[PDB]
Design a protein around this ligand. Structure first.
Ligand SMILES: NC(=O)c1ccc[n+]([C@@H]2O[C@H](COP(=O)([O-])OP(=O)(O)OC[C@H]3O[C@@H](n4cnc5c(N)ncnc54)[C@H](O)[C@@H]3O)[C@@H](O)[C@H]2O)c1
Ligand SMILES: NC(=O)c1ccc[n+]([C@@H]2O[C@H](COP(=O)([O-])OP(=O)(O)OC[C@H]3O[C@@H](n4cnc5c(N)ncnc54)[C@H](O)[C@@H]3O)[C@@H](O)[C@H]2O)c1
Ligand SMILES: [Cl-]
Ligand SMILES: [Cl-]
Lengths: 361, 361
């Protein structure tokens, strides 16, 4: 089989860390196995433009392996040219960079598999971190120190404790639930969630969560909102000017899910006007984020409220080994002709939606 | 009575936030309350040098109110000049900026009271935040974004999850225990503590903590160490070159307790050499931290591993109202002649140690 593997380039950083499996230099650490199995592997980070290495190889690729941190956008146009394509794998979690609805509506026999659970703890940690960084006003505090300044009041004037705050998650799946679990000992006033899938009652009770039926009612009462749903037609552009106007004034918003769940300029405008006190997370649309993407320079009225990073929360060194192994397992399920995929890894099975988390079908 | 109140100045920032009680502008909300009682209140941030406003008023001050974030250093030289001094109050927690041992050993009839518990949650949050920021490599990640860069591998090469790490606290009192409680749902490998005061077995079991009785044994097995003990003779310079040599190579160290528990240059050398991967916290010696203090510019080999802030974790807006009210209550106990202090607030009562947490007596 011919396999095209699209990952980020480590460049000079490859020499610093041998455990960096998720880059083009290291090929998920599965290149020996793919070679021994008799497959042809094309590895590249060159994923944009008409004569990109990706596009050169799409027409006879049997399998494309992608990673959300440097996502090959497998568009309708690319799918139409991909005459041998049978499987797209996501080394990570989240398959929205592939035009899933096009595959499904046309009934094309392409499976889409991701390594469910592989980095959900990593991201839940990152959400907790980002909440704390925003609420406690850490970014300008650290900036003060490295700029050789000292003025406690400049930081304290917009620093709070997370204790006693009302916190809402949009999506209460693997990541959203783990976020709620980690918040319990911080003594929030209340933990809320919105999801068309109810939590099991035992799970709900374990974290003291209350389900809110509609998203406007959810955000209106939350001091902190975190987004933990996949990107699909039902969540694309969900966080826009109108919905932001229904947030509690001065709320903090965390989004480690997908950038395009928000309308980028609407979030920036809300931060600058004070409707949000802070926004942070690691995900952007598109990726790599352009130099003029509004989320880079946006700030609140105090020059703070921005805890943006590149997309890396799900590609910590601990997460990388897990999604690398999961990727190998999915590939083996395909190669053996067993197709004995873990049920939870299956987004599309030969064009059919198996997941329930990407909207109702 | 004459009361000297030493707080940080908020300046123009006071105009931004009404709840900023902890600054010289707002005087803990007690200025009119004191005036109505016929007391004279001198308020200043000028606390260094022989003709500082502090030193001008020391000779006839009945009461000095301090705050750790901008600490009046009540040295033995100042105590010897403070002929009317009867009470020192700490608007906050931690009384080490006062020469407690000099007061005690030379029979000075001065009580020292602090607002115990007022900001212990705030600091425990800050510890969790700092642990996450260091372990997950957040600072350089955010720096990349605002420098208009994008390179996932530059961050991922030194980013880990807190899951599966062994975490040790030095001091397991109000803050240290609250840190362990907040760590439970993060699925650490193990939680450890070192303290001459044992946790009750039930409190140990609640967080799955194991006591380690030797400090070298403790740090030798820890991926993350956090300092949560007061500054006293037993902890001053506790974290020195020799102990750092016994830390696990590449450990992360967090200190929100007091700067002087660490030997400053020893920590910086350990970071630059890689014995530590990261150091962070909000506390320094002395405070305000000099522009050339080595903890400002220190970095690990990748230009990261620094999560320093000014001293503000215990002065979030949520904390300030609590220690402001507690300061009023302590003053009332003094003024009425009842001296009905909360027992947990008493560091020294007329020179005698009441606290057990500042070493054995
Ligand atoms: N930043 C990263 O590195 C990173 C890593 C992993 C995953 N993610 C993203 O997080 C998303 C969630 O991951 P997960 O493991 O929790 O997935 P999951 O499938 O376990 O949970 C997703 C939840 O979202 C719910 N949902 C779907 N549409 C919703 C809507 N309109 N409103 C509210 N809830 C809705 C689903 O019912 C489900 O319960 C992924 O799809 C991915 O886009 C990001
Ligand atoms: N960064 C901030 O804003 C901030 C805010 C509050 C307190 N603090 C500092 O944190 C310290 C702890 O606060 P707390 O509320 O937890 O106090 P606490 O009195 O409840 O607990 C202190 C613990 O440290 C233990 N201890 C003393 N010496 C020790 C030693 N050599 N080794 C190990 N343990 C030792 C004590 O036995 C006690 O259990 C304060 O004294 C203060 O210096 C900082
Ligand atoms: Cl939906
Ligand atoms: Cl001691």
């Amino acid at each position: 089989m011919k396999i095209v593997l699209v990952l980020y380039d480590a460049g000079k950083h490859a020499a610093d860390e041998e455990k960096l499996y998720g880059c083009t230099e290291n090929k998920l650490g599965i290149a020996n196995w793919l070679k021994d199995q008799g497959h042809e592997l094309i590895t590249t980070s060159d994923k944009e433009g008409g004569n990109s290495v990706l596009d050169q190889h799409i027409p006879d690729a049997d399998i494309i392996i992608t990673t959300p941190f440097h996502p090959a956008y497998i568009t309708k146009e690319r799918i139409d040219k991909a005459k041998k394509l049978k499987l797209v794998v996501v080394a990570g979690v989240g398959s929205d960079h592939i035009d899933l609805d096009y595959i499904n509506q046309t009934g094309k026999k392409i499976s889409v598999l991701e390594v469910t659970g592989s980095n959900v703890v990593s991201v839940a940690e990152h959400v907790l971190m980002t909440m704390l960084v925003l609420v406690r006003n850490f970014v300008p505090a650290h900036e003060q120190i490295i700029n050789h300044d000292w003025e406690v009041a400049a930081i304290a004037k917009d620093a709070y404790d997370i204790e006693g705050k009302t916190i809402a998650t949009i999506g209460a799946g693997r990541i959203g639930y783990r976020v709620l679990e980690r918040l319990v000992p911080f003594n929030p006033k209340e933990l809320l969630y919105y999801d068309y899938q109810a939590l099991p009652k035992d799970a709900e009770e374990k974290v003291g969560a209350r389900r809110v039926e509609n998203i406007e009612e959810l955000v209106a009462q939350a001091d902190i909102v975190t987004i933990n749903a996949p990107l699909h037609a039902g969540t694309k552009g969900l966080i826009n000017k109108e919905l932001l106007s229904k947030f509690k004034k001065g709320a903090w918003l965390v989004n480690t899910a997908r950038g395009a769940i928000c309308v980028a300029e609407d979030v920036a405008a809300a931060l600058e006007s004070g409707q949000l006190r802070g926004y942070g997370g690691d995900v952007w649309f598109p990726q790599p984020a352009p130099k003029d993407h509004p989320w880079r320079d946006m700030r609140n009225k105090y020059g703070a409220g921005n805890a943006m990073t590149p997309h890396y929360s799900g590609t910590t060194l601990d997460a990388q080994t897990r999604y690398a192994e999961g990727t190998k397992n999915i590939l083996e399920s395909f190669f053996t002709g067993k197709f004995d995929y873990r049920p939870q890894d299956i987004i599309l099975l030969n064009g059919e939606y198996i997941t329930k988390a990407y909207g109702k079908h």
